[PDB]
């Protein structure tokens, strides 16, 4: 009920108006998924990105709050932090930290990763994974477009609007809501699929930093999904060029037989990922794709 959610809103928020608390804003998005600002907490200092939803005009009120609850309690070095939320009327504010260095999607369209900087940002991606997994939360829509940057080459998972919790009992999964060029094939061969629909998606993205885009993004999203059922894991344009334990470990991700997937557990002691350039060595592919925009 418009009624209950409201209520329980109202139990999440910090009360009152964020107006007090935020000053320099500046409209930046301004989609379905509401209007995005950047601002600056006044006590702290620290640069904010608030969303700002009209609720009676927000479809699935329940996935917002679902969200909320577990970025709440699912806090950790490799997910944007959440902040704070307010309500005020029909009008909900959610507060995240705010990352500089644009997304990871900006970078693998405007420039060149070398092997160094591939295996950083797998590494840390999969400590976000691994993390939620061994939490019972499973992400369902990684993509390099919920991939943020900071400008020291922080990377950060975003977005869990579409994240599923589940449990002993209610352990898998079966709805469809992933981007579909990054869906792993159980999503549609069959129903029920687990946690390593995430691994998979990873290995898609590793796809993105090799060759700019996913594979068959020229095809319309319908078709691409029976491709991707039909074809099975993806065939790279060179890969001659990549060494051979980048190689394995693409193989471990994108592998269809889903026990023979590497979990994310088993894939942060992957020997690709022990060739890791420090993190700062992103900052001048963050800072040429930010200017490139």
Not at 71 to 100: F, H, Q, T
Not at 173 to 182: C, F, I, L, Q
């Amino acid at each position: 009920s418009d009624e209950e959610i409201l209520e329980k809103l109202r139990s999440i928020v910090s009360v009152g108006d964020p107006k007090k608390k935020y000053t320099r804003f500046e409209k930046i998005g301004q989609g379905a998924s509401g209007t995005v600002y950047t601002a600056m907490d006044v006590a702290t200092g620290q640069e904010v990105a608030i969303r700002q939803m009209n609720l009676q005009q927000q479809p699935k009120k329940e996935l917002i709050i679902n969200e909320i609850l577990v970025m709440r309690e699912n806090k950790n070095p490799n997910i944007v932090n959440y902040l704070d939320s307010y309500l005020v009327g029909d009008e909900l504010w959610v507060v995240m930290e705010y990352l500089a260095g644009g997304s990871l999607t900006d970078v693998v369209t405007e420039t060149c990763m070398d092997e160094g900087q591939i295996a950083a940002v797998c590494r840390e991606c999969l400590q976000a994974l691994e993390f939620l997994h061994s939490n019972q939360v499973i992400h369902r829509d990684i993509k390099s477009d919920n991939i943020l940057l900071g400008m020291d080459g922080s990377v950060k998972l975003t977005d869990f609007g579409f994240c599923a919790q589940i449990t002993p009992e209610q352990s898998k999964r079966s709805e469809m809501v992933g981007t579909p060029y990054w869906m792993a094939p159980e999503v549609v061969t069959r129903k029920a699929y687990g946690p390593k629909v995430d691994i998979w998606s990873l290995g898609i993205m590793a796809i993105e930093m090799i060759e700019g885009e996913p594979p068959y993004l020229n095809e319309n999203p319908l078709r691409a999904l029976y491709l991707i059922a039909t074809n099975g894991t993806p065939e790279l344009q060179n890969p001659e060029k990549l060494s051979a334990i980048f190689r394995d470990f693409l193989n471990r991700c994108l592998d269809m037989d889903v026990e023979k997937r590497g979990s994310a557990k088993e894939l942060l002691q992957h020997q690709f990922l022990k060739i890791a350039k420090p993190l700062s060595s992103l900052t001048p592919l963050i800072a040429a794709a930010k200017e490139a925009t």
